[PDB]
Amino acid sequence: MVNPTVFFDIAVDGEPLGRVSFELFADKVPKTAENFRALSTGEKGFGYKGSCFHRIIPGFMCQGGDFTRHNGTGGKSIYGEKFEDENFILKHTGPGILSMANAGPNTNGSQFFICTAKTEWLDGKHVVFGKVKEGMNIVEAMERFGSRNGKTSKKITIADCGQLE
Numbered sequence: 001m002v003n004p005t006v007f008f009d010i011a012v013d014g015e016p017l018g019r020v021s022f023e024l025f026a027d028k029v030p031k032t033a034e035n036f037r038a039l040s041t042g043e044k045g046f047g048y049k050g051s052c053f054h055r056i057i058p059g060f061m062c063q064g065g066d067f068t069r070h071n072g073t074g075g076k077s078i079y080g081e082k083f084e085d086e087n088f089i090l091k092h093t094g095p096g097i098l099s100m101a102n103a104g105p106n107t108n109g110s111q112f113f114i115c116t117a118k119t120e121w122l123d124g125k126h127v128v129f130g131k132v133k134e135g136m137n138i139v140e141a142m143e144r145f146g147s148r149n150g151k152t153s154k155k156i157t158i159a160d161c162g163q164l165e
């Protein structure tokens, strides 16, 4: 009944940077929220720990969650390779929104993006399921290692991850 919280400890070429925590809107998108929560604890035997943020575009978003091919072409959900667009109740209102990457309708896997700007053109195409609670300043620090074409200038990794009380 309380929306769960998850944390990522970020590292930059293997050096600790800081912690970002997220509220997951299990009250609005329980299935999408649950996928991200379980990938964050690793309780299914796979998930986000050790994975990288492969695409970071300043003024736009930080993209991660491809834990099988590390480049935007892989990942899987806890339900099978892909699952459906749960609903589009939540909109891309500004920095800190956590939303699902996909390749067309009903193609959610494990990849996600953290918005660093309002991205309303994504409304109704990408499922918004969470938001940064603590450490937006760490997200901004990550963001500086991106570039216009999304290539990062240092390796940005989820050193550790899990669920908070």
Ligand SMILES: NNS(=O)(=O)c1ccccc1
Pocket (backbone or CB within 6 Å): 061, 063, 100, 101, 102, 103, 113, 122, 126
């Ligand atoms: N390239 N399409 S995507 O699902 O990865 C995506 C869309 C919008 C923002 C970040 C990521």
